[PDB]
Design a protein around this ligand. Structure first.
Ligand code: 0T1
Ligand code: 0T1
Ligand code: CL
Ligand code: CL
Ligand code: CL
Lengths: 503, 512
């Protein structure tokens, strides 16, 4: 029995009835982070009732605030129903992405570590509903989270009414893996000092806390987390990993990093995951993770023993990896700590621990400004996520990408980024399959020489050098030379012709 | 006597001789932050010898790393001499700015709170010289800083050799105003918890620490800081301050801020001065500053009790205010704390205290991304400074600017910023003399509607609205609509014609 508090069993009701607690205009905070631990059955019932209401000519939309990305049962279903008027902070569902890029759902991708604080400040409005997935409800009424923690504790604090989905699909042995801190991380200033001084330090307890009087409904569910698999590292990804591992090796040899490196943060995506695959058989032992997420590769690192322990807010496992950890939860449970996302992504803690940040990117310009989010400057991919949290706060900020995209039709190194998420100051190292650019110490024109020569694809490098050389001659100022008549012209060329390569 | 350690008196020597310790190629770390507490006599002597070398075909340049901005005697003299091959992290000297924008001095404007850490990591190379201005040297060889702390403790730690300038112009009773911590803020990980939980909290001691064996020279000096003329509020600044104070008043009446607000950070200038004058007149009490700087307007508030404490790394005072804080240093030393800049600008502390950040800007685009640094995308003004430290970490991030620049020929609200320092996520409130845009809760298209309607100048609003409307119809995606063919075209128009305003001899979509 998952609901171990006998009194709360009287609150069990159908998902459909529970969804009726959610009214047009409601601000709804949910569990869910990188396709892990989001509610499933209540959103589906909601979505159907929304569609019905729209047909009758009744407005029915909500504001949906999450930990980060969710899954087809939540973002997918509600987007199909046209039922979300505002979404924050991070999405990876294709149907919701389409709503966002069509202007049908309003979207703001906050820094993930800041979302709890902004919610408490009231930036999203009053929380009408918290909808949280649980593994179990303890005898004293504690809510055991599932495969993520995210913002669930904050949403439970803020919400007028609480709906809990108790998901029998989730592993009962997850209980104990979470660390939920009682202190003021994201509340009214002055905030508390968070006493984490080692990446493996537990400072909290295993359950979310909530006043039982606020629980309006408990829904028994049975449905799987769903996420995409990662691309098995190809020649490009392996080349990137090789350059980065060589780099770490040199840093250690020059005594600029310990032999066990520093706590590692590995971002979302295939490239970051391939680096981890490299590290699992690498020359750095006793590694520690202090990350936003644990992807397949990090789990692989724990398995090989190269990494001793990993801190994160969530799992981001492929279907096959997810099945792996559940068969072996007793081996992995002691190697993993799942924290609130305002703690995993705390800039104070990230800087204190000296994290190494490794993140993907859409594109960088020749001066090493980075776009993580908006293709051609206007079309959202996923969101900034915690990449800003970690890039700015880290000891070393590394960005990783194939040098081209769309089968060579796009250069990932451009004259000017069409959108900036990470400024020059927040990016020190760039790696593509062409090589590695170490920008420490360098002015912007010196950054450009390194990025162009080390990272750009041979198809595009002469064009980039041509832009830079002519900018140096003709730019308004020479500190960060640009030709404004053509800075964004490669992007426009792609829009116009389907390729950044001239005819 | 300012040098109270007898042994160190033997290292006193003339400025010119001290300057000979600095060699071509050297990396030099100096005191100096917002025009306060930078060395003066040794840089002047160095510049002379640099020029003399150059005249004989001999190379002589240094790398100059500071706290932040310095003044004519340092950045000015060395720039005139063409003596600086690399400069970091922040400059406001006009001659040095010209070297930077001509490509004669390489420049990187690091986040001010990060500079110490990157120096310790080795990003600037090995420090050959630390050149630091002092009020006094204590009996046990402690170095009492002057009108700023900046990065001086880190530079003293890293440098192979140390030169101290003891400046008798600086009031002796500055001793005690500084708080220097020996804790690991910017050293090798894992770093220490910095335990500051109140803006008035001291965690360290009154002196910089240095192994006396590294002190190669001490120079007796007597010269003024750069006390920039008071920037008297004009009507634009007063309007901006008016909107901001009205906003604060409303936040308090809605219980989203205490009647004592939260610790305040402001940049320097016209607008900040108007805001400080407004606070002195307003309905708020028990104010607290946690900032980079002490500005003129604070002294009156510390005097009256309106402000209880001001934390900063430096003084940023007019001649009037600078001489008044001197004649009353016994009083003001109890009301002010000067900290290392890696503590004044610590993101963890700024967030913990819940600072309200109020910063200037070159321009913002319609979606509320902010340029603080690079005019037309390529020409450096001053540098990012601590604006990223505070904007990102603050409880509320506010950007304040006239809606136009260059006598109306530039719009400070543009289709696309030519350079970005602060992304949308780091900017919640915009204020111009046209009004205040509160962007909390808003998507980028919603941000644009508020920025265009509240902040843009009437001469530019129709052009902005036209760009936005056509972008909404034609952009590659509609999440942050752009027209890449014309996104930077207002900037190019300024480069080519000296104005962003269009000619009616040509078609423009908003004219119809
Ligand atoms: C600690 C917080 C970490 N979180 C974050 O960094 C969140 C933001 N980052 C991200 O979303 C991902 O890292 C990125 C930026 C999408 C990169 O992901 P990744 O390493 O898996 O890259 P990958 O090369 O596989 O490309 C992923 C997608 O982006 C597309 N893409 C990547 N670079 C692109 C570019 N320069 N232009 C256009 N599309 C691009 C790529 O085509 C693919 O989309 P489709 O499958 O074709 O629809
Ligand atoms: C806590 C750390 C705070 N530190 C920082 O914010 C450092 C970065 N910020 C800064 O340097 C300043 O806030 C800014 C952005 C230069 C604005 O300065 P300010 O608020 O005193 O405004 P002000 O209108 O006086 O402008 C300063 C200069 O920039 C120029 N300027 C301002 N906006 C401009 C624009 N949109 N286009 C071109 N020039 C512009 C202005 O003409 C003036 O130049 P001059 O010295 O007369 O040749
Ligand atoms: Cl650097
Ligand atoms: Cl801290
Ligand atoms: Cl917000």
């Amino acid at each position: 029995e998952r609901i171990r508090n006998v009194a709360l069993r009287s609150k069990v009701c159908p998902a459909e009835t529970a969804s009726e607690l959610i009214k047009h205009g409601d601000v709804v905070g949910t569990s869910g982070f990188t396709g892990a631990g989001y509610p499933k059955e209540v959103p589906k019932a909601l979505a159907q009732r929304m569609e019905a209401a729209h047909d009758r000519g009744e407005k029915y939309q909500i504001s949906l605030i999450t930990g980060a990305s969710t899954g087809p049962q939540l973002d997918g279903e509600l987007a199909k129903a046209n039922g979300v008027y505002f979404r924050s902070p991070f999405n990876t569902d294709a149907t919701m992405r389409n709503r966002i890029n069509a202007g049908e759902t309003e979207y703001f991708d906050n820094h993930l570590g800041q979302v709890a604080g902004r919610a408490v400040q009231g930036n999203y409005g009053k929380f009408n509903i918290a909808l949280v997935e649980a593994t179990a409800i303890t005898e004293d009424g504690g809510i055991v989270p599932t495969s993520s923690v995210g913002n669930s504790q904050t949403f439970l604090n803020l919400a007028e009414k609480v709906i809990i989905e108790v998901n029998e699909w989730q592993n009962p042995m997850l209980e104990g893996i979470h660390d939920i801190w009682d202190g003021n991380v994201s509340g009214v200033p002055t905030r508390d000092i968070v006493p984490i001084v080692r990446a493996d330090q537990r400072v909290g307890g295993p359950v979310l806390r909530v006043n039982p009087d606020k629980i309006a409904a408990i829904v028994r569910t049975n449905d799987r987390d769903r996420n995409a698999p990662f691309a098995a590292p190809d020649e490009t990804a392996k080349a990137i990993a090789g350059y980065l591992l060589d780099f770490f090796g040199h840093e250690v040899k020059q005594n600029r990093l310990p032999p066990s490196l520093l706590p590692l943060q590995s971002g979302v995506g295939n490239v970051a995951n391939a680096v981890l695959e490299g590290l699992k058989e690498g020359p750095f032992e006793n590694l520690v993770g202090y990350s936003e997420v644990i992807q397949d590769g990090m789990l692989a690192m724990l398995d090989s023993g190269r990494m001793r322990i990993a801190s994160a807010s969530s799992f981001s496992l492929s279907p096959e990896a997810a099945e792996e950890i559940n068969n072996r939860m007793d081996f992995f449970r002691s190697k993993i700590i799942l924290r609130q996302q305002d703690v995993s992504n705390s800039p104070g803690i990230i800087r204190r621990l000296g994290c190494i940040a490794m993140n993907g990117m859409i594109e960088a310009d020749i001066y090493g400004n980075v776009n993580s989010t908006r293709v051609m400057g206007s079309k959202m991919m996923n969101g900034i996520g915690g990449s800003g949290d970690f890039a700015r706060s880290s000891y070393l900020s590394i960005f990783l990408s194939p040098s081209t995209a769309k089968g060579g039709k796009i250069s990932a190194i451009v004259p000017m980024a069409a959108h900036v998420d990470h400024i020059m100051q927040d990016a020190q190292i760039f790696v593509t399959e062409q090589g590695l650019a170490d920008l420490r110490g360098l002015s912007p024109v010196q950054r450009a020489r390194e990025i162009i020569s080390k990272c750009a694809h041979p198809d595009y490098r002469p064009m980039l050098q041509d832009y830079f050389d002519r900018a140096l001659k003709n730019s308004f100022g020479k500190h960060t030379p640009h030709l404004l008549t053509e800075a964004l012209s490669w992007h426009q060329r792609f829009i116009d012709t389907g390729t950044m390569l001239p005819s």
